[PDB]
Amino acid sequence: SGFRKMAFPSGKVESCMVQVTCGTTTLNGLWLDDVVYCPRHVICTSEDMLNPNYEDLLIRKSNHNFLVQAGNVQLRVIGHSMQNCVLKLKVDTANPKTPKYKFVRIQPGQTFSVLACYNGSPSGVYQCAMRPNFTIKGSFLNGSCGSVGFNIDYDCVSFCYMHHMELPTGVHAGTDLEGNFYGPFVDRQTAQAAGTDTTITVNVLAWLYAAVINGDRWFLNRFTTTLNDFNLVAMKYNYEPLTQDHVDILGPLSAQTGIAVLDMCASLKELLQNGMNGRTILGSALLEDEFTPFDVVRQC
Amino acid sequence: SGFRKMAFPSGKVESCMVQVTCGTTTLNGLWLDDVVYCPRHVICTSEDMLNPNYEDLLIRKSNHNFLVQAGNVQLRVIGHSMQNCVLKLKVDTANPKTPKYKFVRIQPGQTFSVLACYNGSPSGVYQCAMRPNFTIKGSFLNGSCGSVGFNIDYDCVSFCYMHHMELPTGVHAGTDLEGNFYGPFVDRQTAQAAGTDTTITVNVLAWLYAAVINGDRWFLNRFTTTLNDFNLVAMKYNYEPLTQDHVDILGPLSAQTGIAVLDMCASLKELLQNGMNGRTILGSALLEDEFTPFDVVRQC
């Protein structure tokens, strides 16, 4: 029992983390087989960032302009290419600790583990959700660019995020591992800002099921609402619409607890309309939306 | 920027985790050099647990009664001994991935990372605090006994916890790695229950400094209180007393922010007396007490 924000064990990813330096900029890279992946803005000067043409900037670079360090061993770069907003640095040594891996892009609402790194060295691991506005609320300091986000399934690491920048509100933006940004953000200096965000309704419901599984039942009621009438209340409170697919995904948790999804929705409606009246749910005084149905099943 | 409950990278510990079976009971063990550490209750039957004499139960066991699995390789047990509430199983193979390590006992109020494991396989990692009542609010299911808690300093893993049991309130109790329980709990079946708990004041203050460092300033005020008068309010709200040592430990965070500790205490007094009036601090609607001053410095 108990319920915690839980990351995947990070060992398989720690073994892929390297240091990448170009000019005076140092950041993190991901070493898989004979390729190191890092943010392409590693090749930029502070003045390049105002309006960079990365095609031009990369033509002016050579393999020897990239210094790659894997622990103490230096990795010889024998080629380089750009793939959208990431750089691919071919190196002369395949990573002997390359796990089985995939590059997968995730959906707003899904979660992943972040291995925060500095100078190629792992510093900590925590769980994040892709917000509906395609930002993540991470914990990143200067030098963390190139840190990656991932999930593990069986023995296979599914990489889904690499970190590129902090937006003015303190939230974070990055790309998938094919170099394509999540959301309408760019790796250049603009006034770009996070758009308005919404609460991930299906996750809040999943977490309410986690609470019931853990003996937190005070918010339950005998009422049941319809999908339509729930969604009228959701919109008012800046919650995402709930679909029948969401109801189906919550199926197993509904069965394990014996509480129908639309019954839980009536509880969520009441919580939204009245607050918690000084009580807590799974140790929180607000409605948590960064646990997916899978996260709850995996931990309960 | 940003602030998250962050665990240490777990790779060094994952490489030490093994499966230990005795009779029909399977749980987790920690493999360091040629020794595997696990909860001694692995040798018990459900009926032994009602009133076990572990001295008797262990005399009746042989090395071949213990089956130790490290991934696919079976580890031959060549000796066994009891050390308080842990078993030490000598095996014929030193763990080639043994990190630099120490066994340290922690203090209530300090934090550590938990690597939850099942059948010797790591499942997730999360941060915990040792509560003042010597329980931890973990996330543990059947089979998690033997999972360990740890901190990392430089390259050295300091093991501080191994998991033994769940108490009736759903909180968790275990030992240090010398087998000595945290708190007044025993590895036998009784009506034992967690005692009354208190809030870790110095940590709440640390987390308020983290919030200021991250731009959350709405709870600040121009007032300053005395240590004595703060502690009269702390007691009323079930907070631990604040000592001058606590003030000194908060020194660096005070200097980084320019807010004196006793100035912050006046903010905490107000928050305790009035609540948050529907606002949040670092994404929480309640006062968080599971981040130490070190945790804040490390992440900010």
Numbering used by the authors:
A (entry chain A), B (entry chain A): 1 to 300
Q: What does the study report here?
A:
Besides, SARS-CoV-2 VOCs carry mutations at varying frequencies in the Mpro that are specific to Alpha, Beta, Gamma, Lambda, and Omicron. where Alpha, Beta, and Gamma have the substitution K90R, Lambda has the substitution G15S, and Omicron has the substitution P132H. To elaborate on the impact of the G15S, K90R, and P132H mutations on the structure of Mpro, the apo-form structures of G15S, K90R, and P132H were determined at 1.77, 1.66, and 1.82 Å resolution, respectively. There is only one protomer in an asymmetric unit in each crystal structure, and all 1–301 residues could be traced in the electron density map. The mutant residues 15 and 90 are located in domain I and residue 132 is located in domain II. All these mutations are far away from the catalytic pocket; thus, it is reasonable to speculate that the G15S, K90R, and P132H mutations do not directly affect the architecture of the catalytic pocket. G15S, K90R, and P132H showed merely a slight difference from WT, with average root-mean-square deviation (RMSD) values of only 0.54 Å, 0.52 Å, and 0.58 Å, respectively, indicating that all these three mutations had a limited impact on the apo structure of Mpro. It is worth mentioning that the mutation of the amino acid at position 15 from glycine to serine did not cause any serious structural changes to the backbone, except that the substitute of serine formed an additional hydrogen bond with a surrounding water molecule. The catalytic efficiency (kcat/Km) values were determined to be 2.66 × 104 M−1s−1 for G15S, 3.05 × 104 M−1s−1 for K90R, 2.64 × 104 M−1s−1 for P132H, respectively, which are comparable to 2.71 × 104 M−1s−1 for WT. It is indicated that the G15S, K90R, P132H, and WT have similar enzymatic kinetic parameters and the impact of the three substitutions on Mpro could be neglected.
